[PDB]
Each structure stands twice: as structure tokens, then as C-alpha cells.
Amino acid sequence: KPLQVAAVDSS
Amino acid sequence: APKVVKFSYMWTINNFSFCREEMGEVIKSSTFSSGANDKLKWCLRVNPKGLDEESKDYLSLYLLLVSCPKSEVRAKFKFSILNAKGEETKAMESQRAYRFVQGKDWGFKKFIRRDFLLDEANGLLPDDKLTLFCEVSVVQD
Predict the structure, then answer these.
(1) Any chain A CB within 8 A of the CB of B102?
(2) Which residue in B has a C-alpha nearest to residue A10's C-alpha?
(3) What residues form DSSP beta bridges with B112?
């Protein structure tokens, strides 16, 4: 699994 | 010409290993603002154990517009972790400006895998503290 995912979203 | 105000905030989460086990925990920073003196208050929001099942292996990190009396504010943002030497690492930026309204956040559901964070060799929880650095660039109408 990626260490970090740079996809931006809103909670 | 858009008019842009840059500001930042450093947040240390102490006693990181005392975060709740059950999923759903939210931790928030104190509020912060630019000098622009426009009534906008922001904070950081962390889910130490992810927002949901798909993200349970990650820490999630968001920028929240806590207070804003105007309809909307656009802002770019960047988050970094400060390592055991005080330097920025593992940063991610939003790239473009996102549209905030009061109570809205934007950020990274999968900011960093927790097993990397908890591996002492990476030096990211020195003394059981997680230090995060947020830089914001807000558009002022």
C-alpha cells in the first residue's frame, strides 16, 4: 500500500 | 491579480501512543489565522487511526475552516511532518486552491501509513510526539 496518497478530499 | 496571504502553524500532538484504539477519534489543533484580520479561523484535524475502514492503516490530516462569516474562501495548503532533527519530511501539498466554507475541511485521508509513523527508525514520533507543520496560502478577495 502506498506510504502516502496525495489525493485531496473533504471529510 | 489574485491577492494571496501566506501563513503557517506548527502543531505538536503529545502522547501519541495514548490515542484511542477504537476508530473514529478526531484530534484538533488550536485555531490559527493569518494577520489579514478578516475573522477567519482555521485548525488542523487528525484522525490517528484513519477516517474509515479503507483508511484505517493511515493517519488522516485535514485543514478545517472553523470560523468564516463570508460565503467562501479559496486556499492552497501543504502539510509536513517535522522529524527528530526539526526538519520537514513527508510533505504533501494540495497543488491547487480548494474552496472552503465555514465547517469544511480539505486534506489527505491517507496522509501517512501508521506503521511507518510508528517505526522508531524513521524518527517521526520522538518522545511520543508527532509534530505537524501546515502552510496555507489564502486568496483574499
Answers:
(1) no
(2) B106
(3) B59
Cell 486534506 found at: B107
User: If you measure CA to CA, which chain A residue comes closest to B108?
Assistant: A8
> In this complex, which of B62, B104, B112 lies closest to A3 when CB atoms are compared?
B112
> Containing H/E element for B108?
strand B105-113
CB atoms within 10 A of CB B12: 12
Domain range for B100: 3-140
- Grid cell digits, residue B126: 520522538
Q: Looking at the complex, report in whole angstroms how far the Cα of residue A4 sits from the nearest Cα belonging to chain B.
A: 5
The three cell numbers of residue B57 are 492503516
Method: X-ray
d(CA B111, CA B123): 17
Cβ contact A9–B113 (<8 Å): no
Residue A9 with chain B: CB contacts under 8 Å: 106-109
Question: What's the domain count of chain B?
Answer: 1
> To which residue does cell 484505517 refer?
B56
